[PDB]
Amino acid sequence: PRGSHMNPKRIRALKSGKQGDGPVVYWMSRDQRAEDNWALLFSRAIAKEANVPVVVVFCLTDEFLEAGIRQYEFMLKGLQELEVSLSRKKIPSFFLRGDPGEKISRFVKDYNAGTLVTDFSPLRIKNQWIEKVISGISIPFFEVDAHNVVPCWEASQKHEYAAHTFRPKLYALLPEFLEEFPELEPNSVTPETLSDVLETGVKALLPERALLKNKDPLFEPWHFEPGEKAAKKVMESFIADRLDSYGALRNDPTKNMLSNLSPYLHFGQISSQRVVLEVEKAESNPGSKKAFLDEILIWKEISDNFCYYNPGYDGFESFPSWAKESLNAHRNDVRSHIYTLEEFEAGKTHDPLWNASQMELLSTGKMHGYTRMYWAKKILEWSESPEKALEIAICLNDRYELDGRDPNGYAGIAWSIGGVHDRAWGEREVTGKIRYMSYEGCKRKFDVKLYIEKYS
DNA sequence: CGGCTCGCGCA
DNA sequence: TGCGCGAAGCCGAT
Numbered sequence: 110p111r112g113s114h115m116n117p118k119r120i121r122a123l124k125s126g127k128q129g130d131g132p133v134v135y136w137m138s139r140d141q142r143a144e145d146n147w148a149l150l151f152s153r154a155i156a157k158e159a160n161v162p163v164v165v166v167f168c169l170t171d172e173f174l175e176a177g178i179r180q181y182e183f184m185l186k187g188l189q190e191l192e193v194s195l196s197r198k199k200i201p202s203f204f205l206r207g208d209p210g211e212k213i214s215r216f217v218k219d220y221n222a223g224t225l226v227t228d229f230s231p232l233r234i235k236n237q238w239i240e241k242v243i244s245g246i247s248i249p250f251f252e253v254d255a256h257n258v259v260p261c262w263e264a265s266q267k268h269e270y271a272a273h274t275f276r277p278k279l280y281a282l283l284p285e286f287l288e289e290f291p292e293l294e295p296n297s298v299t300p301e302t303l304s305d306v307l308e309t310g311v312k313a314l315l316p317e318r319a320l321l322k323n324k325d326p327l328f329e330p331w332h333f334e335p336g337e338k339a340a341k342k343v344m345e346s347f348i349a350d351r352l353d354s355y356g357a358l359r360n361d362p363t364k365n366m367l368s369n370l371s372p373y374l375h376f377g378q379i380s381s382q383r384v385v386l387e388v389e390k391a392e393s394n395p396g397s398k399k400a401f402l403d404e405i406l407i408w409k410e411i412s413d414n415f416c417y418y419n420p421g422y423d424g425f426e427s428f429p430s431w432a433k434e435s436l437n438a439h440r441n442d443v444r445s446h447i448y449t450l451e452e453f454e455a456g457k458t459h460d461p462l463w464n465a466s467q468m469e470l471l472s473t474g475k476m477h478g479y480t481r482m483y484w485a486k487k488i489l490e491w492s493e494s495p496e497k498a499l500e501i502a503i504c505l506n507d508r509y510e511l512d513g514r515d516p517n518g519y520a521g522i523a524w525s526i527g528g529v530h531d532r533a534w535g536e537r538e539v540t541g542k543i544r545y546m547s548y549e550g551c552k553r554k555f556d557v558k559l560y561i562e563k564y565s
Numbered sequence: 566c567g568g569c570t571c572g573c574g575c576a
Numbered sequence: 577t578g579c580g581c582g583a584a585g586c587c588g589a590t
Protein backbone atom coordinates (compact mmCIF):
# COMPACT_ATOMS: atom_id res chain seq x y z
CA PRO A 110 0.00 0.00 0.00
CA ARG A 111 2.15 2.85 -1.36
CA GLY A 112 5.21 4.16 0.49
CA SER A 113 8.83 4.29 -0.65
CA HIS A 114 10.67 3.62 2.63
CA MET A 115 8.01 1.04 3.55
CA ASN A 116 8.65 -2.69 3.20
CA PRO A 117 5.35 -4.44 2.34
CA LYS A 118 6.52 -7.62 4.09
CA ARG A 119 6.07 -5.89 7.46
CA ILE A 120 2.31 -5.70 6.80
CA ARG A 121 -0.21 -8.46 6.14
CA ALA A 122 -3.93 -8.38 5.42
CA LEU A 123 -6.11 -9.82 8.19
CA LYS A 124 -9.35 -9.11 6.26
CA SER A 125 -10.41 -7.88 2.83
CA GLY A 126 -13.17 -5.51 1.80
CA LYS A 127 -14.09 -2.14 0.37
CA GLN A 128 -12.17 0.78 1.85
CA GLY A 129 -14.38 3.18 3.78
CA ASP A 130 -14.58 6.92 3.24
CA GLY A 131 -13.53 7.77 6.80
CA PRO A 132 -10.27 8.06 8.73
CA VAL A 133 -7.88 5.17 9.24
CA VAL A 134 -7.74 3.85 12.81
CA TYR A 135 -4.60 2.44 14.43
CA TRP A 136 -5.24 -0.11 17.19
CA MET A 137 -2.21 0.30 19.46
CA SER A 138 -1.63 -2.61 21.85
CA ARG A 139 2.05 -3.63 22.06
CA ASP A 140 4.07 -0.69 20.65
CA GLN A 141 3.11 2.23 22.91
CA ARG A 142 5.28 4.87 21.25
CA ALA A 143 5.09 7.63 18.64
CA GLU A 144 8.58 7.42 17.11
CA ASP A 145 10.06 4.43 15.27
CA ASN A 146 6.63 2.78 15.05
CA TRP A 147 6.03 0.79 11.86
CA ALA A 148 2.39 0.12 12.74
CA LEU A 149 1.87 3.89 13.07
CA LEU A 150 3.98 4.88 10.06
CA PHE A 151 2.07 2.39 7.89
CA SER A 152 -1.25 3.81 9.10
CA ARG A 153 -0.17 7.36 8.19
CA ALA A 154 0.68 6.31 4.63
CA ILE A 155 -2.77 4.75 4.13
CA ALA A 156 -4.19 7.97 5.56
CA LYS A 157 -2.07 10.04 3.16
CA GLU A 158 -3.02 7.99 0.10
CA ALA A 159 -6.76 8.17 0.89
CA ASN A 160 -6.66 11.88 1.87
CA VAL A 161 -8.04 10.95 5.31
CA PRO A 162 -6.72 11.58 8.83
CA VAL A 163 -5.16 8.93 11.06
CA VAL A 164 -6.57 8.21 14.52
CA VAL A 165 -5.18 6.20 17.43
CA VAL A 166 -7.21 3.94 19.74
CA PHE A 167 -6.09 2.20 22.94
CA CYS A 168 -8.49 -0.12 24.76
CA LEU A 169 -7.84 -0.48 28.50
CA THR A 170 -8.91 -3.98 29.54
CA ASP A 171 -9.43 -5.77 32.86
CA GLU A 172 -5.99 -7.41 32.55
CA PHE A 173 -4.46 -4.98 35.07
CA LEU A 174 -6.20 -6.86 37.89
CA GLU A 175 -3.93 -9.87 37.31
CA ALA A 176 -0.88 -7.59 37.66
CA GLY A 177 -0.01 -5.00 40.29
CA ILE A 178 0.41 -1.23 40.56
CA ARG A 179 4.04 -1.45 39.41
CA GLN A 180 2.95 -2.43 35.89
CA TYR A 181 -0.21 -0.29 35.82
CA GLU A 182 1.61 2.93 36.73
CA PHE A 183 4.46 2.12 34.32
CA MET A 184 2.07 1.68 31.40
CA LEU A 185 -0.30 4.51 32.34
CA LYS A 186 2.38 7.16 32.89
CA GLY A 187 3.86 6.41 29.47
CA LEU A 188 0.44 6.75 27.85
CA GLN A 189 -0.03 10.26 29.27
CA GLU A 190 3.31 11.28 27.75
CA LEU A 191 2.34 9.54 24.50
CA GLU A 192 -0.95 11.47 24.45
CA VAL A 193 1.00 14.74 24.43
CA SER A 194 3.43 13.47 21.79
CA LEU A 195 0.61 12.40 19.46
CA SER A 196 -1.14 15.73 20.08
CA ARG A 197 1.93 17.55 18.73
CA LYS A 198 1.40 15.86 15.33
CA LYS A 199 -2.37 16.52 15.17
CA ILE A 200 -3.08 12.83 15.84
CA PRO A 201 -5.94 11.99 18.25
CA SER A 202 -5.70 9.31 20.93
CA PHE A 203 -8.92 7.63 22.08
CA PHE A 204 -8.74 5.58 25.28
CA LEU A 205 -11.52 3.04 25.87
CA ARG A 206 -12.37 0.72 28.76
CA GLY A 207 -13.82 -2.75 28.31
CA ASP A 208 -13.34 -5.69 25.98
CA PRO A 209 -11.48 -4.74 22.77
CA GLY A 210 -13.44 -7.43 20.93
CA GLU A 211 -16.62 -5.37 21.40
CA LYS A 212 -15.41 -1.80 21.93
CA ILE A 213 -13.11 -1.63 18.89
CA SER A 214 -15.89 -2.90 16.61
CA ARG A 215 -18.21 -0.31 18.16
CA PHE A 216 -15.57 2.39 17.63
CA VAL A 217 -15.11 1.50 13.95
CA LYS A 218 -18.82 1.89 13.21
CA ASP A 219 -19.34 4.96 15.41
CA TYR A 220 -16.35 6.85 13.97
CA ASN A 221 -16.94 5.56 10.40
CA ALA A 222 -13.47 4.10 10.00
CA GLY A 223 -12.08 3.44 6.53
CA THR A 224 -9.23 1.09 7.43
CA LEU A 225 -8.14 -0.62 10.65
CA VAL A 226 -4.49 -1.31 11.50
CA THR A 227 -3.04 -3.00 14.59
CA ASP A 228 0.35 -4.13 15.87
CA PHE A 229 1.52 -7.73 16.05
CA SER A 230 1.56 -9.87 19.20
CA PRO A 231 1.81 -13.68 19.49
CA LEU A 232 -0.26 -13.82 22.69
CA ARG A 233 -3.42 -15.91 22.84
CA ILE A 234 -5.64 -13.02 23.99
CA LYS A 235 -4.66 -10.85 21.02
CA ASN A 236 -5.69 -13.52 18.52
CA GLN A 237 -9.01 -13.86 20.36
CA TRP A 238 -9.51 -10.09 20.22
CA ILE A 239 -8.64 -10.06 16.51
CA GLU A 240 -11.17 -12.79 15.71
CA LYS A 241 -13.85 -10.90 17.64
CA VAL A 242 -13.16 -7.70 15.69
CA ILE A 243 -13.00 -9.71 12.46
CA SER A 244 -16.63 -10.81 12.87
CA GLY A 245 -17.83 -7.32 13.82
CA ILE A 246 -16.30 -5.11 11.11
CA SER A 247 -16.60 -4.74 7.34
CA ILE A 248 -13.56 -2.50 6.71
CA PRO A 249 -10.11 -3.84 5.72
CA PHE A 250 -8.01 -5.02 8.66
CA PHE A 251 -4.21 -4.97 8.52
CA GLU A 252 -1.48 -5.99 10.96
CA VAL A 253 2.07 -4.63 11.21
CA ASP A 254 5.01 -6.23 13.04
CA ALA A 255 6.30 -3.07 14.73
CA HIS A 256 8.10 -4.96 17.52
CA ASN A 257 10.59 -7.21 15.69
CA VAL A 258 13.25 -6.08 13.23
CA VAL A 259 12.29 -8.97 10.94
CA PRO A 260 8.56 -9.80 10.77
CA CYS A 261 7.69 -12.90 12.78
CA TRP A 262 5.99 -14.66 9.86
CA GLU A 263 8.88 -13.74 7.55
CA ALA A 264 11.76 -14.86 9.79
CA SER A 265 10.66 -18.50 10.06
CA GLN A 266 7.58 -20.56 9.21
CA LYS A 267 8.23 -23.24 11.85
CA HIS A 268 8.83 -23.49 15.59
CA GLU A 269 12.62 -23.24 15.77
CA TYR A 270 14.28 -25.88 17.93
CA ALA A 271 17.32 -23.82 18.98
CA ALA A 272 19.01 -20.48 18.42
CA HIS A 273 21.78 -21.99 16.28
CA THR A 274 19.06 -22.96 13.79
CA PHE A 275 17.31 -19.57 13.96
CA ARG A 276 20.55 -17.55 13.93
CA PRO A 277 21.42 -18.04 10.21
CA LYS A 278 17.83 -17.26 9.17
CA LEU A 279 17.65 -13.96 11.07
CA TYR A 280 21.10 -12.68 10.10
CA ALA A 281 20.43 -13.45 6.42
CA LEU A 282 17.37 -11.16 6.35
CA LEU A 283 19.03 -8.35 8.34
CA PRO A 284 20.35 -6.32 5.34
CA GLU A 285 16.79 -6.01 4.00
CA PHE A 286 14.77 -5.29 7.15
CA LEU A 287 17.38 -3.30 9.12
CA GLU A 288 16.78 0.26 7.95
CA GLU A 289 16.33 3.77 9.31
CA PHE A 290 12.96 5.13 10.41
CA PRO A 291 11.27 7.87 8.36
CA GLU A 292 9.88 10.78 10.35
CA LEU A 293 6.21 10.71 11.33
CA GLU A 294 4.36 13.25 9.19
CA PRO A 295 1.74 15.25 11.14
CA ASN A 296 -1.91 15.24 10.17
CA SER A 297 -3.48 17.66 7.69
CA VAL A 298 -7.17 17.14 8.53
CA THR A 299 -7.77 17.23 12.28
CA PRO A 300 -11.03 15.42 13.05
CA GLU A 301 -11.67 9.06 28.51
CA THR A 302 -9.40 10.97 30.88
CA LEU A 303 -6.16 9.10 31.52
CA SER A 304 -5.88 10.67 34.99
CA ASP A 305 -9.33 9.40 35.99
CA VAL A 306 -8.61 5.87 34.75
CA LEU A 307 -5.36 5.99 36.75
CA GLU A 308 -6.99 6.70 40.13
CA THR A 309 -9.73 4.11 39.57
CA GLY A 310 -7.07 1.51 38.77
CA VAL A 311 -4.78 2.06 41.75
CA LYS A 312 -7.82 2.01 44.05
CA ALA A 313 -8.76 -1.46 42.76
CA LEU A 314 -5.16 -2.74 43.02
CA LEU A 315 -4.37 -1.30 46.46
CA PRO A 316 -5.44 -4.37 48.53
CA GLU A 317 -3.24 -6.63 46.36
CA ARG A 318 -0.14 -4.46 46.86
CA ALA A 319 3.06 -6.13 48.04
CA LEU A 320 3.82 -5.03 51.59
CA LEU A 321 6.42 -5.49 54.31
CA LYS A 322 6.02 -6.28 58.02
CA ASN A 323 5.45 -2.60 58.89
CA LYS A 324 2.71 -2.18 56.23
CA ASP A 325 5.25 -0.51 53.93
CA PRO A 326 5.11 -1.34 50.20
CA LEU A 327 8.04 -3.27 48.77
CA PHE A 328 8.08 -1.72 45.29
CA GLU A 329 10.60 1.06 44.61
CA PRO A 330 9.27 3.07 41.63
CA TRP A 331 12.31 5.39 41.34
CA HIS A 332 14.51 2.81 39.59
CA PHE A 333 12.86 3.10 36.15
CA GLU A 334 10.41 5.90 35.45
CA PRO A 335 8.41 5.14 32.29
CA GLY A 336 7.88 7.17 29.14
CA GLU A 337 9.25 7.34 25.60
CA LYS A 338 11.69 10.09 26.60
CA ALA A 339 12.99 8.08 29.56
CA ALA A 340 13.43 4.99 27.38
CA LYS A 341 15.78 6.92 25.09
CA LYS A 342 17.98 8.06 27.99
CA VAL A 343 18.39 4.49 29.26
CA MET A 344 19.44 3.37 25.78
CA GLU A 345 21.84 6.31 25.37
CA SER A 346 23.51 5.68 28.74
CA PHE A 347 23.92 1.98 27.94
CA ILE A 348 25.81 2.53 24.67
CA ALA A 349 28.13 5.18 26.11
CA ASP A 350 28.75 3.74 29.60
CA ARG A 351 27.64 0.08 29.78
CA LEU A 352 27.97 -1.40 26.28
CA ASP A 353 31.76 -1.77 26.49
CA SER A 354 31.66 -3.99 29.60
CA TYR A 355 28.50 -5.88 28.59
CA GLY A 356 30.18 -8.91 27.02
CA ALA A 357 32.29 -9.54 30.14
CA LEU A 358 29.97 -8.49 33.00
CA ARG A 359 26.50 -9.44 31.74
CA ASN A 360 26.33 -12.47 34.07
CA ASP A 361 27.34 -10.59 37.24
CA PRO A 362 24.29 -9.47 39.28
CA THR A 363 26.52 -7.37 41.56
CA LYS A 364 27.40 -5.17 38.55
CA ASN A 365 24.67 -3.00 37.01
CA MET A 366 25.90 -3.46 33.45
CA LEU A 367 22.71 -4.66 31.75
CA SER A 368 20.83 -2.41 29.34
CA ASN A 369 17.75 -2.29 31.64
CA LEU A 370 15.62 -1.95 28.49
CA SER A 371 13.12 -4.79 29.02
CA PRO A 372 10.41 -2.72 30.83
CA TYR A 373 10.44 -0.23 27.95
CA LEU A 374 10.74 -2.93 25.28
CA HIS A 375 7.82 -4.93 26.71
CA PHE A 376 5.38 -2.00 26.65
CA GLY A 377 6.78 -0.81 23.32
CA GLN A 378 8.04 2.51 24.67
CA ILE A 379 11.20 2.10 22.56
CA SER A 380 11.83 0.27 19.29
CA SER A 381 14.27 -2.64 19.37
CA GLN A 382 15.16 -1.77 15.77
CA ARG A 383 16.24 1.70 16.92
CA VAL A 384 18.44 0.04 19.55
CA VAL A 385 20.11 -2.08 16.86
CA LEU A 386 20.68 0.97 14.64
CA GLU A 387 22.58 2.85 17.36
CA VAL A 388 24.43 -0.24 18.61
CA GLU A 389 25.63 -1.11 15.09
CA LYS A 390 27.14 2.35 14.54
CA ALA A 391 28.90 2.48 17.94
CA GLU A 392 32.65 1.88 18.29
CA SER A 393 32.45 -0.40 21.32
CA ASN A 394 34.19 -3.68 22.15
CA PRO A 395 33.49 -6.15 19.30
CA GLY A 396 32.92 -9.04 21.72
CA SER A 397 30.34 -7.06 23.69
CA LYS A 398 28.48 -5.94 20.56
CA LYS A 399 28.04 -9.49 19.25
CA ALA A 400 26.94 -10.71 22.69
CA PHE A 401 24.37 -7.91 22.98
CA LEU A 402 23.16 -8.25 19.39
CA ASP A 403 22.49 -11.97 19.93
CA GLU A 404 20.34 -11.08 22.97
CA ILE A 405 17.97 -8.46 21.52
CA LEU A 406 17.81 -9.87 17.96
CA ILE A 407 18.06 -13.67 18.11
CA TRP A 408 16.72 -14.39 21.59
CA LYS A 409 14.11 -11.63 21.74
CA GLU A 410 12.48 -12.42 18.38
CA ILE A 411 12.71 -16.21 18.80
CA SER A 412 10.47 -15.91 21.87
CA ASP A 413 7.88 -14.32 19.58
CA ASN A 414 8.48 -17.23 17.20
CA PHE A 415 7.99 -19.67 20.08
CA CYS A 416 4.67 -18.19 21.23
CA TYR A 417 3.39 -17.71 17.67
CA TYR A 418 3.78 -21.35 16.56
CA ASN A 419 2.96 -22.91 19.96
CA PRO A 420 -0.49 -22.00 21.34
CA GLY A 421 0.40 -23.77 24.60
CA TYR A 422 3.60 -21.82 25.21
CA ASP A 423 2.78 -21.59 28.95
CA GLY A 424 2.13 -25.31 29.39
CA PHE A 425 3.90 -28.63 29.84
CA GLU A 426 2.82 -29.80 26.37
CA SER A 427 5.05 -27.27 24.59
CA PHE A 428 8.13 -28.94 26.10
CA PRO A 429 10.21 -31.19 23.81
CA SER A 430 9.83 -34.96 23.80
CA TRP A 431 13.14 -35.60 25.57
CA ALA A 432 12.30 -33.18 28.39
CA LYS A 433 8.74 -34.47 28.86
CA GLU A 434 9.95 -38.07 29.10
CA SER A 435 12.73 -37.07 31.51
CA LEU A 436 10.49 -34.98 33.78
CA ASN A 437 7.73 -37.62 33.83
CA ALA A 438 10.13 -40.35 35.00
CA HIS A 439 11.14 -38.26 38.04
CA ARG A 440 7.61 -37.27 39.12
CA ASN A 441 7.66 -39.73 42.04
CA ASP A 442 11.16 -38.70 43.16
CA VAL A 443 11.31 -37.36 46.71
CA ARG A 444 12.03 -33.63 46.71
CA SER A 445 14.53 -32.19 49.17
CA HIS A 446 12.08 -29.40 50.04
CA ILE A 447 8.48 -28.58 49.14
CA TYR A 448 7.41 -24.92 49.09
CA THR A 449 4.01 -23.50 48.20
CA LEU A 450 3.29 -20.38 46.15
CA GLU A 451 3.11 -18.18 49.26
CA GLU A 452 6.50 -19.34 50.56
CA PHE A 453 8.11 -18.71 47.17
CA GLU A 454 6.41 -15.30 46.94
CA ALA A 455 7.61 -14.06 50.34
CA GLY A 456 11.14 -15.46 49.93
CA LYS A 457 10.82 -18.00 52.75
CA THR A 458 13.14 -20.71 51.40
CA HIS A 459 16.27 -22.21 52.94
CA ASP A 460 18.48 -20.75 50.18
CA PRO A 461 19.66 -17.19 50.95
CA LEU A 462 20.61 -16.79 47.27
CA TRP A 463 17.11 -17.63 46.01
CA ASN A 464 15.47 -15.42 48.65
CA ALA A 465 17.77 -12.52 47.71
CA SER A 466 16.89 -12.99 44.03
CA GLN A 467 13.18 -12.80 44.82
CA MET A 468 13.78 -9.68 46.93
CA GLU A 469 15.41 -7.90 43.99
CA LEU A 470 12.23 -8.73 42.07
CA LEU A 471 9.88 -7.60 44.85
CA SER A 472 11.81 -4.35 45.47
CA THR A 473 12.75 -3.09 41.99
CA GLY A 474 10.32 -4.99 39.76
CA LYS A 475 13.30 -6.29 37.77
CA MET A 476 15.59 -9.24 38.53
CA HIS A 477 19.07 -9.67 37.10
CA GLY A 478 19.23 -11.77 33.95
CA TYR A 479 21.62 -14.30 35.47
CA THR A 480 19.72 -14.86 38.73
CA ARG A 481 16.46 -15.39 36.84
CA MET A 482 17.74 -18.82 35.77
CA TYR A 483 18.59 -19.87 39.32
CA TRP A 484 15.30 -18.38 40.52
CA ALA A 485 13.26 -20.49 38.06
CA LYS A 486 15.33 -23.69 38.10
CA LYS A 487 15.15 -23.90 41.90
CA ILE A 488 11.34 -23.67 41.75
CA LEU A 489 11.30 -26.88 39.71
CA GLU A 490 13.58 -28.56 42.26
CA TRP A 491 11.42 -27.52 45.23
CA SER A 492 7.86 -28.06 43.95
CA GLU A 493 5.29 -30.84 43.98
CA SER A 494 5.30 -31.38 40.21
CA PRO A 495 6.61 -29.77 37.00
CA GLU A 496 3.10 -28.41 36.41
CA LYS A 497 3.10 -26.65 39.78
CA ALA A 498 6.63 -25.37 39.13
CA LEU A 499 5.46 -23.93 35.81
CA GLU A 500 2.41 -22.39 37.48
CA ILE A 501 4.38 -20.78 40.32
CA ALA A 502 7.15 -19.45 38.07
CA ILE A 503 4.69 -17.93 35.59
CA CYS A 504 2.56 -16.40 38.35
CA LEU A 505 5.48 -14.75 40.14
CA ASN A 506 6.96 -13.63 36.81
CA ASP A 507 3.79 -12.00 35.46
CA ARG A 508 2.85 -10.38 38.79
CA TYR A 509 6.09 -8.72 39.90
CA GLU A 510 8.34 -8.38 36.82
CA LEU A 511 7.98 -5.06 35.01
CA ASP A 512 8.66 -6.93 31.75
CA GLY A 513 6.22 -9.71 32.63
CA ARG A 514 3.33 -10.98 30.51
CA ASP A 515 5.76 -11.03 27.58
CA PRO A 516 6.76 -13.72 25.06
CA ASN A 517 10.29 -13.37 26.42
CA GLY A 518 8.97 -14.48 29.81
CA TYR A 519 7.11 -17.60 28.71
CA ALA A 520 9.99 -18.71 26.49
CA GLY A 521 12.47 -17.89 29.25
CA ILE A 522 10.50 -19.86 31.83
CA ALA A 523 10.08 -22.80 29.45
CA TRP A 524 13.86 -22.69 28.93
CA SER A 525 14.57 -23.10 32.65
CA ILE A 526 11.92 -25.74 33.40
CA GLY A 527 11.11 -27.50 30.13
CA GLY A 528 14.45 -27.19 28.35
CA VAL A 529 12.88 -25.37 25.40
CA HIS A 530 15.60 -24.07 23.05
CA ASP A 531 18.09 -26.06 25.15
CA ARG A 532 19.62 -29.55 25.19
CA ALA A 533 19.92 -32.42 27.65
CA TRP A 534 22.48 -32.54 30.45
CA GLY A 535 23.58 -34.88 33.22
CA GLU A 536 20.89 -37.11 34.68
CA ARG A 537 19.84 -36.03 38.17
CA GLU A 538 17.14 -36.73 40.74
CA VAL A 539 13.83 -34.72 40.46
CA THR A 540 15.11 -32.33 37.66
CA GLY A 541 16.14 -35.25 35.50
CA LYS A 542 18.01 -34.16 32.37
CA ILE A 543 17.10 -30.46 32.61
CA ARG A 544 20.08 -28.12 32.87
CA TYR A 545 21.25 -27.95 36.48
CA MET A 546 22.47 -24.84 38.30
CA SER A 547 23.81 -24.89 41.85
CA TYR A 548 24.58 -22.30 44.50
CA GLU A 549 28.24 -23.35 44.32
CA GLY A 550 28.24 -22.69 40.57
CA CYS A 551 27.27 -19.06 41.17
CA LYS A 552 29.87 -18.88 43.95
CA ARG A 553 32.78 -19.31 41.52
CA LYS A 554 31.44 -16.79 38.98
CA PHE A 555 30.39 -13.75 41.04
CA ASP A 556 30.44 -12.48 44.62
CA VAL A 557 27.32 -14.15 45.99
CA LYS A 558 27.82 -12.49 49.39
CA LEU A 559 27.50 -9.04 47.81
CA TYR A 560 24.24 -10.01 46.08
CA ILE A 561 22.59 -11.51 49.18
CA GLU A 562 23.64 -8.56 51.34
CA LYS A 563 22.27 -6.05 48.81
CA TYR A 564 18.72 -7.44 49.06
CA SER A 565 18.67 -8.64 52.69
C1' DC B 566 28.57 -36.33 12.12
C1' DG B 567 29.44 -31.45 14.41
C1' DG B 568 27.80 -28.31 17.77
C1' DC B 569 24.88 -26.57 20.66
C1' DT B 570 23.27 -19.28 25.65
C1' DC B 571 25.69 -25.59 32.63
C1' DG B 572 29.21 -27.70 36.63
C1' DC B 573 33.93 -28.94 37.64
C1' DG B 574 39.18 -29.47 38.17
C1' DC B 575 42.95 -26.77 37.43
C1' DA B 576 46.55 -22.24 36.66
C1' DT C 577 38.58 -15.57 36.97
C1' DG C 578 39.64 -18.13 32.53
C1' DC C 579 39.84 -22.55 30.04
C1' DG C 580 39.06 -27.26 28.65
C1' DC C 581 36.34 -31.22 29.59
C1' DG C 582 32.16 -33.95 30.89
C1' DA C 583 27.41 -35.22 29.90
C1' DA C 584 23.54 -35.66 27.27
C1' DG C 585 19.57 -35.65 22.97
C1' DC C 586 18.84 -33.88 18.50
C1' DC C 587 18.55 -30.72 14.47
C1' DG C 588 20.11 -30.40 9.68
C1' DA C 589 23.54 -29.91 6.36
C1' DT C 590 24.62 -33.94 3.34
Ligand SMILES: Cc1cc2nc3c(=O)[nH]c(=O)nc-3n(C[C@H](O)[C@H](O)[C@H](O)COP(=O)(O)OP(=O)(O)OC[C@H]3O[C@@H](n4cnc5c(N)ncnc54)[C@H](O)[C@@H]3O)c2cc1C
Binds near residue numbers: 359479521
Ligand atom coordinates in the same frame (compact mmCIF):
# COMPACT_ATOMS: atom_id res chain seq x y z
C1 LIG D 1 12.93 -17.41 34.05
C2 LIG D 1 13.08 -16.17 33.21
C3 LIG D 1 12.03 -15.28 33.11
C4 LIG D 1 12.14 -14.11 32.34
N1 LIG D 1 11.15 -13.16 32.40
C5 LIG D 1 11.12 -12.21 31.52
C6 LIG D 1 10.00 -11.36 31.38
O1 LIG D 1 8.98 -11.50 32.05
N2 LIG D 1 10.08 -10.34 30.47
C7 LIG D 1 11.19 -10.14 29.71
O2 LIG D 1 11.16 -9.20 28.92
N3 LIG D 1 12.28 -10.93 29.81
C8 LIG D 1 12.25 -11.92 30.67
N4 LIG D 1 13.33 -12.78 30.74
C9 LIG D 1 14.47 -12.51 29.90
C10 LIG D 1 15.60 -11.74 30.57
O3 LIG D 1 15.75 -12.14 31.94
C11 LIG D 1 15.30 -10.24 30.51
O4 LIG D 1 14.99 -9.89 29.17
C12 LIG D 1 16.46 -9.37 31.00
O5 LIG D 1 17.03 -9.96 32.17
C13 LIG D 1 16.02 -7.95 31.28
O6 LIG D 1 17.19 -7.16 31.61
P1 LIG D 1 17.96 -6.35 30.51
O7 LIG D 1 16.98 -5.90 29.42
O8 LIG D 1 18.75 -5.27 31.13
O9 LIG D 1 18.92 -7.43 29.88
P2 LIG D 1 19.90 -7.13 28.67
O10 LIG D 1 21.15 -8.00 28.85
O11 LIG D 1 20.17 -5.67 28.59
O12 LIG D 1 19.08 -7.61 27.43
C14 LIG D 1 18.69 -6.70 26.38
C15 LIG D 1 17.37 -7.16 25.81
O13 LIG D 1 17.54 -8.46 25.20
C16 LIG D 1 16.38 -9.25 25.42
N5 LIG D 1 16.77 -10.44 26.17
C17 LIG D 1 17.84 -10.57 27.01
N6 LIG D 1 17.95 -11.76 27.56
C18 LIG D 1 16.87 -12.46 27.03
C19 LIG D 1 16.42 -13.78 27.22
N7 LIG D 1 17.02 -14.67 28.01
N8 LIG D 1 15.30 -14.16 26.55
C20 LIG D 1 14.70 -13.27 25.75
N9 LIG D 1 15.03 -12.00 25.51
C21 LIG D 1 16.14 -11.66 26.18
C22 LIG D 1 15.35 -8.36 26.13
O14 LIG D 1 14.48 -7.76 25.19
C23 LIG D 1 16.25 -7.34 26.82
O15 LIG D 1 15.57 -6.11 27.07
C24 LIG D 1 13.33 -13.85 31.64
C25 LIG D 1 14.40 -14.77 31.75
C26 LIG D 1 14.28 -15.91 32.51
C27 LIG D 1 15.44 -16.87 32.60
